[PDB]
Symmetry: D2
């Protein structure tokens, strides 16, 4: 499917007022923004910053998004966000992501995303590049 | 059945020239609030009865794009009513031609507004759907 | 400068959870979004919907924004938002806007915006069109 | 002096391919929180002392655009400290070449966290700037 491990990639974020709602907790929709930011940072770390992606005519598009909410985060909490690849298809990828509170590791949100790889110009489906497929478990190319 | 109409503004759009995919969940949320209002459950009623609704799960499937200044029609069907929760089924369609843009499914929990603990949905509310 | 009156244009909006913060009130930044939506709706009503603007190669760009905050709005309040033109220059316009609570008319926010008119293609400064300048106090063209 | 560094993501961008102008105020807000943290005033300290900071006025002047994946440097200078309020002066610059993107000015009021009424800035806080 797609294998994960090692020093498992986590991106760290701070919760600001913009992220919160009237309840005094993170607005539930905003966890998907945090998860999106983490996928961008995982790509960067594997050698696929935004200039590299547009260089190779690659664009990633969300076709489906699912989130399950468990415990709340408050103003000024820090969040750790994973970006695992659960399955790797020819022209798409499924991400499995966890948002945890940094102080105590309690799971706040779990998300699953089906993400399509397309031509940046024309938005038509394309195969995930070789080097990218490789990166998703270890990248010296 | 019930549909709520919304306008797409600059704030909703992304570098692609289309609605940012996350934002469809906001539009669907607005429609649920408006469905509740129309069945007699505005915000003042909810805080009156010590009710708060919290999303426990959210799923969206994306089909076709919407652009700046499009109008959207958004449904808010209640597929199930459980003791302490409700499950919604929603569609976002472009107003001009009815093309399906997004579909969403949500499990929404009812909790005490004071203590945030799970509580039963009130009788009157359960009836308002039924 | 630029003259206002009549049945003074107001756009009506509802406050949803997305608009609120941890304080239980509208997040202050969001009033600028409401004011922007009102300017778009005022333009629409004067004959300048988005398809008309791109038709005439017009784009409006904010060069400055000032807001003063007075009283708070809560979840599920309705807002009335004005979009007055305070001054009309050759290639730009200054808007003066008020956000009021619908129930009791109390002033929540006042904003001022310097807005530039530019070519939609190339983003270069252009004159505000004749018909648009006219619309800002009465439009049979 | 103090600068906070931020990344521009898709969520920040608009149909123009640049940061949505409203979003610079969010970035400036984050920088004020981070300046306060570094001088010993995290959120837990503020709620500990019954303090809340509220924006009473906000001004932004826009100069040049930032794009997807740019890094931003954001300053958070305190120009004045009054009895019950503070006035900030902020600059947003592109990290790569230091070009000025936005400048902002904010009057921020100190209020009681319980009752929302105006209160004096604590001595310790006034000192931390001075
Ligand atoms: Cl996402
Ligand atoms: Cl790279
Ligand atoms: Cl699904
Ligand atoms: Cl605005
Ligand atoms: Cl029109
Ligand atoms: Cl100014």
């Amino acid at each position: 499917r797609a294998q994960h491990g090692g020093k498992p990639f986590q991106q760290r974020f701070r919760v600001y007022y913009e992220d919160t709602d009237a309840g005094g907790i993170v607005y539930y929709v905003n966890y998907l923004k945090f998860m999106e930011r983490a996928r961008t940072e995982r790509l960067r770390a594997l050698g696929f910053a935004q200039s590299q992606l547009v260089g190779d005519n690659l664009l990633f598009v969300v076709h489906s998004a699912e989130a399950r909410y468990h415990a709340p985060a408050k103003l000024d909490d820090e969040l750790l966000v994973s970006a695992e690849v659960e399955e790797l298809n020819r022209a798409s990828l499924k991400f499995r992501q966890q948002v945890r509170r940094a102080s105590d590791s309690v799971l706040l949100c779990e998300g699953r995303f089906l993400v399509a790889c397309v031509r940046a110009d024309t938005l038509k489906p394309r195969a995930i590049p070789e080097t990218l497929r490789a990166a998703f478990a270890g990248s010296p190319d």
